[model samples]
Target: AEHPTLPIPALLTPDAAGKIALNVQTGSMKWKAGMQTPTWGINGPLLGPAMRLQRGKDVAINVTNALPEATTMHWHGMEIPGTSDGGPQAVIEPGKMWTAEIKVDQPATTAWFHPHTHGLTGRQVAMGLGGLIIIDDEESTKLPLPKEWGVDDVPVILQDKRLDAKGHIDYQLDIITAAVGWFGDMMLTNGTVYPQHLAPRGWLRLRFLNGCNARSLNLATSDGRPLYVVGSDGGLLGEPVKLTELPILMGERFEVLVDTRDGKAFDIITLPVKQMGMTLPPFDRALPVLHIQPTLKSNEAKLPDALVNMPAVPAADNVKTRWLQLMMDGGGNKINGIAFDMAKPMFDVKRGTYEKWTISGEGDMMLHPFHIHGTQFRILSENGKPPAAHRSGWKDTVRVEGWRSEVLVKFDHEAPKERAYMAHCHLLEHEDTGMMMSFTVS
Candidate 1:
């Protein structure tokens, strides 16, 4: 079967006064050849638009909920105050509008926004209510890289979906699937199945987001080309790290530069990886995510040796240490033997103080993508040694498998007791069921 052209999301930039509006509504799209699958999106059907934000600017986003149920739009990987962080507490009822006033104080990075209502995140996000937020800084704009939207710089939101026999979206959760989170049989890139992108014959920047509910993606090129990774969840790395295959877990983002100077057609595919104590079918084999056909002509751009100057990892000496255990209890995932509580906070930390957190997983074969809101952290180690070069940058999410992983963290924003920030497994089902916790930064 021939692939369809990849759909590039419309770019949404802040107006002259740094304001934007988003409407969450219900609609339908022809996901299959002839079937109209119901979906929820911001501004249109299927995913929302890619929003461009600038650092040092205060952005006021008016979000109006028009869906049947209440939801909250959380800015994932953004460093904002709790009141504007859009956690579970910030709920937008049907026909209600909420304004999130945020002072952009972070580095240039690829963040995202999605519904974060407790116990409903999996359903809403799976129904297609998510979008990308691209933040630019003065330094990033000065780099000699591909910066044009929809031309050279592309936003790739990777998600998988399962369809019923009649080609409708199947979001039903069974007990077994709930235990490990949902996995899909078909892949979608920017809401298009079997998608292809025609790019200019030069350097292309692909901002990749692993937006899966439960599955982890092992990405590689069909021609075995190197992926020059330049950025992570928080921002740009000091230099580009070349890798053949990159594994991105849920809620993680990575920016890579692909040199298409050869003008060859290649496929961006996902290699098989073991997960959830077993290798699931369809996902167990290599699958094509996006096909690239470099047919346009453009001026050749050189890849910069250095991207940005990053902060050094803080020392672990004299820092407060905390331990968190990820385990299963009574058929539900738990963090430190407790489920998520809306009115309670798991711990409290002093703002602007550095600490060391060691997160360990109790399951022998399960891997959890641990995510924390409101701040980015530096990984100290994965198991017992140092992390890879690509993982040395700032991050808001990390993979915690059977052993333990350590991180140096410090919260710069205030998260009060009433509107606390959350730390949870990015697997939507795991978070909705149990394995989540909240904390206050005073």
Candidate 2:
């Protein structure tokens, strides 16, 4: 099978229905600088599958759990059934397999799939059990989009690593980082750091997923050219949005279209900032993290016209405001619930309640990209933009900025306790570190 890919990671389409398998094995990876040692993944080496999902269709994925404990497969933002949501309830034990069909009943957007096994998410996904999921539709197919795999369209999975002298994936987080949120020192796209690829000499598309646990990417090109951020967590912006720097939190996904049409090689870099430091409750400032030097440019590709027809919803009486909390515990990985009572829910919402839930974070040091189990919400405000980007579109996940940044949300579907959706940070380590939670929409 021959495919024209940009590099190890690309911003493109995939087969409609797919399959995912989880195998916990030990191997080597680019952990420290250029050195390699041992790590883990789903099937072979690292990560799992790059699942391509079609909008408004039925997708069936079969996953086999080969670990020593029970695990759940939470579809980051697929808009599926609660039972099929893969929350803590729908966990699969070792050697056992789980199968479910998801009706892609939402606008075209970028989503993800990863292990939702409470307290073990960071360890598994960081070692390689995470990948991208793209939901395509005719609306997005009409855009003048770039399709140069690595060159134009690319998937950026960011993380902060503490590599050993050997350059291997280090799986350790101190109380400081755990308190501030786990961030990797290394920045990678589809498993390669600073890896280069060929692209057409024109406009290009880059689908970036801030796969970092607690770190947020203040994205900017080394050249400082505007990055056409056509879409975000929900779907397309009102129009093709542009920005010199885009801030994507853990678990956040973006459809970035850049004009790499010229044949010059560019290093679309992710620089470190003062925000990288973990301050106390009364936080201080930040720190710098990574450096990327991509190879030269390649041939250019075309983008679509109109992505998806996202309709807006007027905040009606049906909307409900749900309060969410983020904190840390003294356990192994503390990105999940610090108040887990096995029976006491993180929050409760009616299945069919289409109320606007305002999620307010009560912290000062770290941030979390809170995701919901089965639905999406329009961003009512960001730092306070009443109508941020043209949005009526729903999002299962959103980045909670700083300590007091609030996000407006409304659920569209309902599910049972056995099958519920989740809302957590996009940071793999944070999710694994226990910075996550799920609710049943019954």
> 1-442, model 2: which lDDT tens digit per residue?
1212223422333244454334544466654545675665555566654566678766666777766667667778767777677766777888788876677877777788777776666666666667667777887766667644444555666554445566666667555655555554455555655555555566667777776666666777766777777777667765666677776666777787777545555556654444545232111222222223234544435544555555655656645666555665345433334643334456667755566555545543445566666776766654334534522245556545554334455555676555556666555555555555666665
TM-score on alpha carbons, each prediction: 0.97, 0.82
lDDT of each: 0.87, 0.59
Model 2 segments more than 4 A misplaced: 1-6, 9-26, 30-35, 67-70, 147-152, 166-168, 276-307, 327-338, 346-348, 383-394, 402-408, 425-435
Q: Given candidate 1, what's the lDDT at residue 412?
A: 92
Overall local distance difference test of candidate 1: 0.87
Show model 1 residue runs off by greater than 4 Å: none
Candidate 1 per-residue lDDT over residues 47-92, each given as its tens digit: 8988888898888999999999999999999998888989889999
Give the per-residue Cα lDDT of candidate 2 at 33. Answer: 46
The candidate that wins on TM-score is 1
